[PDB]
């Protein structure tokens, strides 16, 4: 697509979120960079309202799928870059098992050379001493598969996945994500065949930062579609032995 | 700084210029808005005296650096917002290679909620069939780096950069900009370490406007100062592999 | 309009008011200047009869909408300047919630180079220990939106807005303003589409003034009408990325 | 080493090269996978700039020695995996007999789960009708031994080998490779005793690919170090006969 | 066959096994070499998961019949080499008399110059104090005949034999092997007449190895098919005496 050309190098990223969880209001600003050639995101988020009232790991998915590394053979399945520069609206309902839920609406688009993710989040029905409001999540993050399918009717995609959040007592808190992305622009977009994004995330702290923050390193790679290269490598293995 | 708080949302902008180039007198009024969070300027300029006697692109730099997006880690280097609301005086000498020069003096300050840029410009020594008076510039604009350094003696900044104006025959007309900014107020200002502003500008016409005008979309982002985040991301990459 | 040409520079202002509130008679003279290009008013009012018998903030709205800054794209909606130099009659009923009311009639017109506002005010039904006669208003002023609509039948405008006056105990005293303006002259006037004036006011005292007085700084800007510039800036953002 | 644990399964590979040979600029992107347990590489390279200006076989060595199968008894001699995940810099000078030379600098390191090989190549002094610029190489590849020795002073290895490129007229074009690898990380690395890598490569084309490309299947196995197992098998042969 | 040409010299071998016996999980990696001209295998196996939970001799048959020495006159009966390089699937059920059973599935094929045997094994119904889980087998191995017949329907072979494992108390533990081999490739294979492989195996330990391991020396020779050479030697004996 034409949109994929906007991601050939390192792109600066800006993230802005306004949130309200069980009436606790907060805002977060994030900055970093994305390098889609390597599916690499390097970001730092700062809570601009003081102390974040929920654990940082619960917001990782909310805080840039246009930076996924799509293998060459899957390039016709990259809806995210195809929607650029006009961007897409990313909407989610996130259900925390045995607890409350987050509802999010984000606009992801270019503002000049900067890729901007602007989000509004609302959390309701959280338990006072649940894993979220009780701050029982470990400050770490598992690897996951993000399942994507085309939504022809809406000229977009439907996305589903389940995040496993480690809890301090060795248990796991599931967060079932229901997501949809729709293009902002009027131009054609790529509607993909079913596939997934394999994600790996690491969380850290900046030792010189006094504000409540999160440093995130993420790697995102598309997979799940093949183009029969295995048969060609098997044929090459057969022809070599036949000559040697 | 306290001045940076004045730029958290969208700010209306008013630009007023009185000019005289080789004795040709003209005035321009501009309106728009600035959103420093995104380093975004959206402006429309109208020549109120009839036909502008110089090409619109030659005046782009003269017609709002307080709207630059300064990354969080560079916030102590933003002289422009720190001088607000009292504002700053922005003075330039602009040398058009092999041609005349512009000398400008502007006061940039708030008038209530409106950020106002009031300018006087004088152009001398222009050649009758040069690129400027001969109107040989294309109606477009390149991206540039604006170099900033502190001027401790004047409690301000010195700024230097070279604009590349495309000419209709494929050649380029350089415009070397020498600039200084000094605060109007008595309060403390931020004197920055050396850095630059990366600028991108697009020019257009309003299809329903009959007056001589210019529509400008500009993105301005500060860069050139780092705070060693690369080493932290490298350490995160090393710790993940060590655990996985 | 032809009337708008009378406001291109700084215009001296004279305000004269004769008032009677619950039988307490007073007079006020004000002087200052208006700069409609910046929507800026700088005025000083002196009570010429001794002590003002009502709080100064209650009279701010009574004491110059012809000085509003109308954006270029809204210039066909500026009734106030279009009525000049002949001027307009500005009439109001101001209801102080749970208290009395003011009725005012003013003539606003040029007398040579001076813009003059001559007012008669009558206040009735005020409570002895209400916020007004009890002098319980703080000496400050909030920002408001002044709603304007055309009154085709009267060749003028109807204006409505609600002032929030802060009270010393943290409560707010509302003052609902009902206003009409009719031209004095026979010439054509501009009848506007619905819009509003965004106002900001600051109150102070002259440290060298011994008379009962008020120093006022006000900024007035018209808003509420757009001319689809957002679509043009979105198209410019789309064309730049398509070329870069 | 700890680095060897990163190679127990199939690892996705990304190769990126920017090249300039006698002023002819080109870029190549490659993808595939490596399975070090079997010393197996399966890769596909695409010239992203159009037609590759040199024969594909000349670039095979430039386009992943960390995927060599090291026999268990030689595991203390595997410098390549020991440098991971931080990686190593691989530098070469490649002399084409009676013709020009290539100079290359590559960084090989993990980016999340992906093993990335980023290369810059510069070729100079090539003859217009030599085997390289004259495109006289057959599209095939011989088997070779890659000689490795420790470079204690640089905490790395020196590598030397000679590639035999078949020419269309039955002659052979030699390419003498001089190579050095140095670790990027600060951690300890394995400095090996002298040994070699035995390589076998097959080249093919993807029948559904219209871009200029190369499909490569490579097998790499370390050899040249023994741990006296022959004497143990001889002793077993002697003890069996002595009992039977 | 064409496959037999791949075995004229010494071939490196890699063996990989993942096993689960009565829920005890383990993995084994083996390396060595095979010389089919002499029917000779020299291998060393290492348990990579720590202590092997079953006696090493029970796994000997699971851990390369393509290395059998087939006499020249029986070369048309060598199914194993004829299936190469694509390889064959070797499946077994092994019944330990009065005890549990192993079920195995292996793929034996070339990966470049290396002959690879990849196996999955599942053992069930073993007695806690039986000869296997009670570790009562001696660390030695008897000689056996491996009976082969064609399986025309499956384009492969059926193999049957009974292993005699010596027990520490002088008794013998039988292991009845039921085996089938099917080609992986689409090319023609040799379907043999009934014959057998005569096997001899010796087990030892590497005196410098601290990991749980087994050193194996095996000789495998095909027999059971003659081509009437005895009558020719009898005729030669008769003709010599008739002349002398």
- What six digits make up the tokens of A195? 């596939």
- What six digits make up the tokens of C52? 């003002």
Distance CA C123, CA C22 (A): 6
Distance CA D107, CA D88 (A): 6
Q: Could you give phi then psi for residue A147, rounded to 5 degrees?
A: -90, 125
Q: What share of chain D is helix, strand, coil (3-state, %, to 5)?
A: 15, 50, 35
Distance CA C95, CA C101 (A): 5
D in contact with C (at least 3 C-beta pairs within 8 A): no
**Which DSSP symbol is given to D142?**
-
C232 touches B at CB < 8 Å: yes
Distance CA C137, CA C145 (A): 21
- What six digits make up the tokens of D216? 């490569």
Pairing status of strand A144-151 against strand A156-166: antiparallel
For residue B112, the distance in angstroms to the closest alpha carbon of chain C comes to 6
Question: Choosing among C232, C238, C239, which should be mutated to test the B contact, i.e. which has the most B CBs within 10 A?
Answer: C232
Looking at the DSSP assignment, which residues form a beta bridge with residue C21? C24, C123
Q: Could you give phi then psi for residue B6, rounded to 5 degrees?
A: -75, -5
Distance CA D107, CA D111 (A): 11
Cβ contacts of C145 within 8 Å, gap of 6 or more:
C161, C196, C197, C198, C199
**Which DSSP symbol is given to D192?**
P
Check if the beta carbon of residue C103 is closer than 8 Å to that of residue C184.
Answer: no
Q: CA triplet D72, D73, D79: central angle to 5 degrees?
A: 80
Helices of type H across E62-174: 79-82
C1-239 has CATH 3.40.50.300 classification: no
Cβ contacts of D94 within 8 Å, gap of 6 or more:
D61, D62, D101, D102, D103, D104, D175, D176, D177, D178
D236 touches A at CB < 8 Å: no
Q: For residue A234, is it left (φ>0), alpha (ψ between -120 and 50) or beta?
A: alpha
Taking only residues 178 to 217 of chain D, the set having a beta carbon closer than 8 angstroms to any beta carbon of chain B reads 185
DSSP of chain B: --GGGGGSS-EEEEEEEEEEETTEEEEEEEEEEEETTTTEEEEEEEETTSS-SS-GGGGTTT--GGG-B--GGGGGG-HHHHTTTT-EEEEEEEEETTS-EEEEEEEEEEETTEEEEEEEEEEE---TTSTTTTT-B-S----EEEEEEEEGGGTEEEEEEEEEEEBTTS-EEEEEEEEEEEESSSS----PPSEEEEEEEEEE--TT--SSEEEEEEEEEEES---SHHHHHHHHHHHHHHH-
For residue A107, the distance in angstroms to the closest alpha carbon of chain C comes to 15
- What six digits make up the tokens of E77? 């009966």
Q: Give the number of C-alpha atoms closer than 13 A to the C-alpha of residue C232, restricted to the C-beta side.
A: 20
Q: Which residues in chain A have Cβ-Cβ distances shorter than 8 Å to C242? A: 2
Q: Could you give phi then psi for residue B35, rounded to 5 degrees?
A: -135, 90
Cβ contacts of A185 within 8 Å, gap of 6 or more:
A83, A86, A87, C238
Residue in C121, C123, C15, C102 with CA at minimum distance from that of residue C66 = C15
Helices of type H across chain D: 79-82, 229-243
**CB–CB of B241 and D185 under 8 A?**
no
Distance CA B23, CA B26 (A): 10
- What six digits make up the tokens of E31? 């390396």
Helices of type H across E59-114: 79-82
E in contact with A (at least 3 C-beta pairs within 8 A): yes
**C84 CB-contact burial (10 Å; exposed 0-12 / middle 13-18 / buried 19+):** buried
Question: Choosing among C68, C217, C236, which should be mutated to test the B contact, i.e. which has the most B CBs within 10 A?
Answer: C236
| Count of CB atoms situated within 10 Å of the CB of A150 | 17
- What six digits make up the tokens of E218? 């095996």
Cβ contacts of E36 within 8 Å, gap of 6 or more:
E7, E8, E11, E66, E67, E68, E69, E70, E81
Check if the beta carbon of residue E23 is closer than 8 Å to that of residue E202.
Answer: no
Check if the beta carbon of residue A139 is closer than 8 Å to that of residue A62.
Answer: no
Taking only residues 46 to 85 of chain D, the set having a beta carbon closer than 8 angstroms to any beta carbon of chain E reads 69, 71-73
Question: Choosing among D15, D202, D206, which should be mutated to test the A contact, i.e. which has the most A CBs within 10 A?
Answer: D202
Q: Print burial letters for B187-207: b (CB count within 10 Å at least 16), e (below 16).
A: eebbbbeebbbbbbbbbbebe
Q: CA triplet D70, D74, D76: central angle to 5 degrees?
A: 105
Per DSSP, chain D holds a count of helices (H) and strands (E) of 2, 11
Distance CA D187, CA D80 (A): 13
B-C CB pairs within 8 A amount to 54
**CB–CB of B221 and A112 under 8 A?**
yes
This structure was determined by X-ray
Cβ contacts of A127 within 8 Å, gap of 6 or more:
A99, A100, A133, A134
Q: How far is CA A124 from CA A23, A27, B66, E218, in A?
A: 8, 17, 39, 70
Check if the beta carbon of residue D12 is closer than 8 Å to that of residue D2.
Answer: no
**CB–CB of D219 and E114 under 8 A?**
yes
**CB–CB of C241 and A185 under 8 A?**
no
Kindly identify which residue of chain B lies nearest to residue D111, measuring between CA atoms.
B237
**CB–CB of D217 and A198 under 8 A?**
no
For residue B144, the distance in angstroms to the closest alpha carbon of chain A comes to 13
CA–chain centroid gap for D92, Å, is 11
Residue in C242, C203, C244, C194 with CA at minimum distance from that of residue C222 = C194
Kindly identify which residue of chain A lies nearest to residue D207, measuring between CA atoms.
A232
Distance CA C232, CA C73 (A): 15
Q: Could you give phi then psi for residue E72, rounded to 5 degrees?
A: -50, -45
**CB–CB of C38 and B111 under 8 A?**
yes
Q: For residue A78, is it left (φ>0), alpha (ψ between -120 and 50) or beta?
A: beta
Distance CA A41, CA A16 (A): 16
Distance CA E193, CA E227 (A): 13
Q: Which residues in chain E have Cβ-Cβ distances shorter than 8 Å to D72? A: 29, 31, 44, 46
Cβ contacts of E153 within 8 Å, gap of 6 or more:
none
Residue with tokens 């208003």: C137
Residue with tokens 């001045």: B3
For residue D194, the distance in angstroms to the closest alpha carbon of chain E comes to 21
Residue with tokens 């559904």: D208
Q: CA triplet C220, C230, B140: central angle to 5 degrees?
A: 110
Taking only residues 127 to 166 of chain B, the set having a beta carbon closer than 8 angstroms to any beta carbon of chain C reads none
Distance CA A206, CA A214 (A): 8
Distance CA E243, CA C205 (A): 150
C230 touches A at CB < 8 Å: no
Cβ contacts of A116 within 8 Å, gap of 6 or more:
A13, A14, A15, A16, A107, A108, A109, A110, B38
Distance CA D178, CA C84 (A): 89
Residue in E129, E108, E130, E111 with CA at minimum distance from that of residue E119 = E108
| Count of CB atoms situated within 10 Å of the CB of C97 | 12
Distance CA D100, CA D23 (A): 13
DSSP of A94-140: EEETTS-EEEEEEEEEEETTEEEEEEEEEEE---TTSTTTTT-B-S-
Q: CA triplet A83, A84, A87: central angle to 5 degrees?
A: 75
Residue of D40, D227, D233 lying closest to E217 (CB–CB):
D233
Question: Choosing among C72, C224, C241, which should be mutated to test the B contact, i.e. which has the most B CBs within 10 A?
Answer: C72
Looking at the DSSP assignment, which residues form a beta bridge with residue D202? D217
Instruction: Identify the chains in contact with D, defined as 3+ C-beta pairs within 8 A.
Output: A, B, E
Q: Print burial letters for D42-64: b (CB count within 10 Å at least 16), e (below 16).
A: bbbbbbbeeebbbbbbbbbbbbb
Q: Give the number of C-alpha atoms closer than 13 A to the C-alpha of residue B78, restricted to the C-beta side.
A: 27
A239 touches D at CB < 8 Å: yes
Give chain A's length: 244
Distance CA D175, CA D58 (A): 8
Distance CA C83, CA C109 (A): 9
D114 touches A at CB < 8 Å: yes
Distance CA C37, CA C67 (A): 8
Residue in B180, B225, B187, B186 with CA at minimum distance from that of residue B75 = B225
For residue A6, the distance in angstroms to the closest alpha carbon of chain C comes to 8
Instruction: Identify the chains in contact with A, defined as 3+ C-beta pairs within 8 A.
Output: B, C, D, E
A243 touches E at CB < 8 Å: no
Looking at the DSSP assignment, which residues form a beta bridge with residue C50? none
Distance CA E108, CA D244 (A): 32
- What six digits make up the tokens of C240? 């730049």
Distance CA E203, CA E218 (A): 9
């Amino acid at each position: 697509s034409k949109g994929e050309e906007l991601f050939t190098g390192v792109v600066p990223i800006l993230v802005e979120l306004d949130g309200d969880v069980n009436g606790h209001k907060f805002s977060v600003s994030g900055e970093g960079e994305g390098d889609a050639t390597y599916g690499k995101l390097t970001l730092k988020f700062i809570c601009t309202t003081g102390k974040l009232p929920v654990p940082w790991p619960t917001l990782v998915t909310t805080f840039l799928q246009c930076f996924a590394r799509y293998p060459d053979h899957m390039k016709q399945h990259d809806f995210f870059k195809s929607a650029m520069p006009e961007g897409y609206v990313q909407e989610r309902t996130i259900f925390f098992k045995d607890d409350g839920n987050y509802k999010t609406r984000a606009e992801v688009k270019f503002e000049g050379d900067t890729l901007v993710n602007r989000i509004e989040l609302k959390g309701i029905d959280f338990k006072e001493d649940g894993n979220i409001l009780g701050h029982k999540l470990e400050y770490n993050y598992n690897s996951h598969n993000v399942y994507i399918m085309a939504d022809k009717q809406k000229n977009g995609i439907k996305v589903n996945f389940k995040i496993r959040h480690n809890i301090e007592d060795g248990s796991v808190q599931l967060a079932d994500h229901y997501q949809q992305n729709t293009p902002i622009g009027d131009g054609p977009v790529l509607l993909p065949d079913n596939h997934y994004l394999s994600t790996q995330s690491a969380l850290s702290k900046d030792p010189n930062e006094k504000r409540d923050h999160m440093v995130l390193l993420e790697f995102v790679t598309a997979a799940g579609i093949t183009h029969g290269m295995d048969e060609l490598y098997k044929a090459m293995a057969k022809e070599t032995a036949a000559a040697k």
